[PDB]
Amino acid sequence: SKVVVPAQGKKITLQNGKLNVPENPIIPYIEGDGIGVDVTPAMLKVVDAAVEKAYKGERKISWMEIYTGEKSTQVYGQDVWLPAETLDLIREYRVAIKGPLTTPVGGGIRSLNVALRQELDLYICLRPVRYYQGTPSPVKHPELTDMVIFRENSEDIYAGIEWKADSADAEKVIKFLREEMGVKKIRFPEHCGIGIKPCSEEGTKRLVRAAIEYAIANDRDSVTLVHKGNIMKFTEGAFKDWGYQLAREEFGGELIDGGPWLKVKNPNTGKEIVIKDVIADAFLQQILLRPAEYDVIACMNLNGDYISDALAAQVGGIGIAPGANIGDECALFEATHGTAPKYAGQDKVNPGSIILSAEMMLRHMGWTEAADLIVKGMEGAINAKTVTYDFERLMDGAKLLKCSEFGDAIIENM
Amino acid sequence: SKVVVPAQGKKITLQNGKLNVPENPIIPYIEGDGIGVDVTPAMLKVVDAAVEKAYKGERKISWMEIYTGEKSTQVYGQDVWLPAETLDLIREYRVAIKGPLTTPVGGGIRSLNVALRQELDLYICLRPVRYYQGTPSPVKHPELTDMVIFRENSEDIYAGIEWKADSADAEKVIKFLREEMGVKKIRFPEHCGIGIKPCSEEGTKRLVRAAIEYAIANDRDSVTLVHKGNIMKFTEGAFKDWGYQLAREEFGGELIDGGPWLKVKNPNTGKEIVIKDVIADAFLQQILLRPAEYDVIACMNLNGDYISDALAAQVGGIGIAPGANIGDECALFEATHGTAPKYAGQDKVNPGSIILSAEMMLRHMGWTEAADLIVKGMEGAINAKTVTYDFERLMDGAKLLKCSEFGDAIIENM
């Protein structure tokens, strides 16, 4: 209604579990608030150059701007932070990409990023982190990290089910818990905020299924379920048990030794994938002390959030980390950093996160050649030490480029 | 009843908020399971040598063995994992120290470490992590880390309030949430485990009060409240607000700029302590990229658990990290690693964690001189590269010592 659909261009189609991508597909993109205004132009330009180069003019993306966040209020009026038609158009066109998003405080509005994930049921938050050679790192051996995070997006304490301390609601559920359920374990029931943490069998088996499938499809070496199940036995501990059950039941997993670990034989390469688990606080230690031991990671919402952020900091990628939210019906790729408003408009932040999320978008579309050209350009620009301000402070002998110029340096190294 | 109280020795007394420690105090110690049998002898020997050396024979600790874990079942019978009299004797003698503890699976027994914390109301889990010069680290600059963690021990998702998927209880509380509370946000209400996360005003203000007091008493530079309050507004977000409120209300904090940060003037040194906050997933990134910016940390149960484990791994201290659980009436110091049963009895693991928890025990007793002699010995032994197997693998040119021998190397460097 305020989105103008491209006169040239055709919709991507879902023909039962498989995307049928035209040569001129319409992709919705949400520009983003703050530095979204800088990074999103850089990404439309390097993706267009990559499909122009890979398919020699045969394929072209028809970009369609849709709205969410601060820009949606400037287009539809001060009150609409998430238009109902963004949800519809992402549902419809099947794959979209977005920049960083401002959620307001003061108006009872919960996280717009989490709102897109939950409203469209994009239950997989897929976070690849690997080291790009030559980026400045805080750790001695960042090249040892090559992990892919499958983070559950629809349950956990992130579902936003909670009531304020002293609210009627809170008093009511605390009354129910003490009187009807007989819980004598809340230390101070007065002036007490309550949050609910749900974890279901359908919710964890659909994420774990995707993670092992990823491992079979890319011959990864192992799937690690991370959980804090020694203290949270019926949510986090249920996650690890339903995860192992699904690897036994659906993937024909077998005990290594006398357990608990399983082996899944990859029906294509013949190799064995280890399904193992590790407690989430020892895992935060293990990614720093033995990163080469881990590969594909499956975990719940909160932990997945912490794990990816922590891993992206050790490889030097806080600003170049890609991300996707995938459901059965559509996928939304995204810059995983913030709106950074101090820099907005100055053309200086790193466009690397949304550009590498656009390669994940291309790869997902089946446009592998265009997608390999972007990570080829990326490696080259960083190796050329022809870099953005955030990488040049930490590097000696680098050449400082603006946001837009690092975009052309990715195209030059293609 | 099976503990034999020392014929020489006198009880420590609490004479309103202040410990009155005799020259020959009786300290309860729980040996611990697994490698507890190796580390706890090393710690009784280096602590005795440190008080012998510091006070030239005037003071002496009367050690009294009490029981919890696997050894309690061998003393009181197969079913008693936590005797009621351990709780009483730690209450009574005021300060105790313990080794690693085995909680059994199969018998519905929740975490014995968490059980001591909650049953004795030791609401502060105090975790100091600093770098000891010359220990092998995974990061380029471990010397930049010097933080003290104040982790809330009595609330959060760690209170163990939860019900299994498909249990009558679970069905009942999910029914209450959907019908009586009108929650339409649980994605899959069938086959769903539910955990409760409580956060009260009394529960967070008593931890934050201790953390700022620590900062005033040791002239630390700042207190950082870390929380995941953008998604969990009424528990984690209530934590940050009640934390700032208590710094305004009780410590006379003032806005820096137009907020949100506060300044508290230290009434002894005149210096300003910054009370600031940072979201918990960006904080896991910040301790690796800018560790010198942070000092005293206050946080809730789960986050505190993750933060300390992560910080102890980057300074090379997964096996030398000290810890305490402090309440208003008693304190329990502890090895913060596991029972490690494969090595148990072999005299090879690092006794550094329980020894440095014993210096925190000594310091807490007011026996500062004996406590400085232990960290003097520690620095010396590690600097002499006269070290235990876990540090020698990662070091070149080290001399390998057994557990007991690293204990004598701490005494030699005293």
The residues that bridge with B200 in the sheet, in sequence order, are A192
Method used to determine the 3D structure: X-ray
Residues of B in contact with A228 (CB under 8 A): 302, 305
Q: Which string of DSSP letters, residue by residue, matches B57-126?
A: TS---EEEEE--THHHHHHH-TT-SS-HHHHHHHHHHSEEEE---PPPSSS----HHHHHHHHTT--EEE
Collapsed DSSP state (helix, strand, coil) of residue B340: coil
Q: A356: domain range?
A: 1-414
CA angle in degrees (0–180, nearest 5) for A342-A347-A350: 85
d(CA B278, CA B244): 12
- Identify the active-site residue in A67, A93, A158, A244: A158
CA angle in degrees (0–180, nearest 5) for B122-B126-B130: 165
B227 among annotated binding-site residues = no
Q: Which two tokens stand for residue B315?
A: 């300074």
Amino acid found at A396: D
Beta strands in B158-271 (DSSP E): 162-163, 192-200, 222-227, 254-255, 262-265
Task: Count Cβ–Cβ pairs < 8 Å, chain A vs chain B.
Answer: 241
Collapsed DSSP state (helix, strand, coil) of residue B254: strand
H/E segment holding residue A375 = helix A368-383
**Is the CB of B160 less than 8 angstroms away from the CB of A185?**
yes
Q: Which string of DSSP letters, residue by residue, matches A242-298?
A: HHHHHHHHHH--EESBTBS-EEEE-TTT-PEEEEEEEEHHHHHHHHHH-GGG--EEE
> What residue has token string 């929380």?
B227
Residues of A in contact with B230 (CB under 8 A): 103, 111
Q: Which two tokens stand for residue B314?
A: 């980057």
**B196–chain A nearest CA distance, Å:** 5
- Identity of the residue in A202, A233, A285 whose CB atom sits nearest the CB atom of B313: A285
Burial class (CB within 10 angstroms; exposed 0-12, middle 13-18, buried 19+) of B149: buried
Q: What is the distance, to the nearest Å, from the Cα of residue B222 to the centroid of all Cα atoms in its chain?
A: 20
Active site residue B281: yes
Q: What is the distance, to the nearest Å, from the Cα of residue B21 to the centroid of all Cα atoms in its chain?
A: 22
Give the residue from chain A lying closest to B230, CA to CA: A111
Q: What is the CATH number of the domain that holds B349?
A: 3.40.718.10
- Identify the active-site residue in B228, B263, B276, B348: B228
Report the DSSP pairing between strands A146-152 and A296-299. Answer: parallel
Active site residue B158: yes
- Identity of the residue in B139, B181, B186 whose CB atom sits nearest the CB atom of A139: B139
What are the helix and strand counts (H, E) for chain B? 13, 18
Question: A184, B160 in Cβ contact below 8 A?
Answer: no
Q: What is the DSSP letter of B157?
A: G
**A368–chain B nearest CA distance, Å:** 31
**Is the CB of A306 less than 8 angstroms away from the CB of B284?**
yes
- Identity of the residue in A160, A282, A309 whose CB atom sits nearest the CB atom of B282: A309
Active site residue B241: no
d(CA B227, CA B277): 8
Collapsed DSSP state (helix, strand, coil) of residue A127: strand
Distances (CA, A) of B380 to A405, B196, B351, B406, B413: 52, 47, 15, 11, 5
Give the residue from chain B lying closest to A168, CA to CA: B181
- Identity of the residue in B162, B235, B282 whose CB atom sits nearest the CB atom of A193: B235
Q: What is the DSSP letter of A144?
A: G
Closest CA to B287 of A259, A310, A7: A310
**Is the CB of A191 less than 8 angstroms away from the CB of B201?**
yes
Distances (CA, A) of B300 to A390, B198, B212, B229, B242: 32, 10, 15, 11, 12
Contacts 24+ apart (CB under 8 A), B68-74: B68/B30, B68/B98, B68/B101, B68/B112, B68/B116, B69/B30, B69/B32, B69/B33, B69/B101, B69/B102, B69/B103, B69/B112, B70/B33, B70/B102, B71/B31, B71/B32, B71/B33
Angle, nearest 10°, between helix axes A403-412 and A36-54? 10
B59 among annotated binding-site residues = no
Q: What is the DSSP letter of B137?
A: -
Burial A124-140 (b: 16+ CB within 10 A, else e): bbbbbbbbbebbbbbbe
Cis ω before A260 (30° cut-off from 0):
yes
B230 among annotated binding-site residues = no
**A238–chain B nearest CA distance, Å:** 7
**B27–chain A nearest CA distance, Å:** 28
d(CA A73, CA A101): 12
**Is the CB of B161 less than 8 angstroms away from the CB of A155?**
no
H/E segment holding residue A198 = strand A192-200
Active site residue A241: no
Residues of A in contact with B165 (CB under 8 A): 199-201, 234, 238
Collapsed DSSP state (helix, strand, coil) of residue A216: helix
Question: B327, B363 in Cβ contact below 8 A?
Answer: no
Q: Which two tokens stand for residue B389?
A: 């197997």
Chain A contact probe: residue of B140, B158, B185 with most A CBs at under 10 A: B185
d(CA B256, CA B290): 21
Overall resolution, Å: 2.5
Total domain count for chain A? 1
- Identify the active-site residue in B131, B132, B158, B244: B158
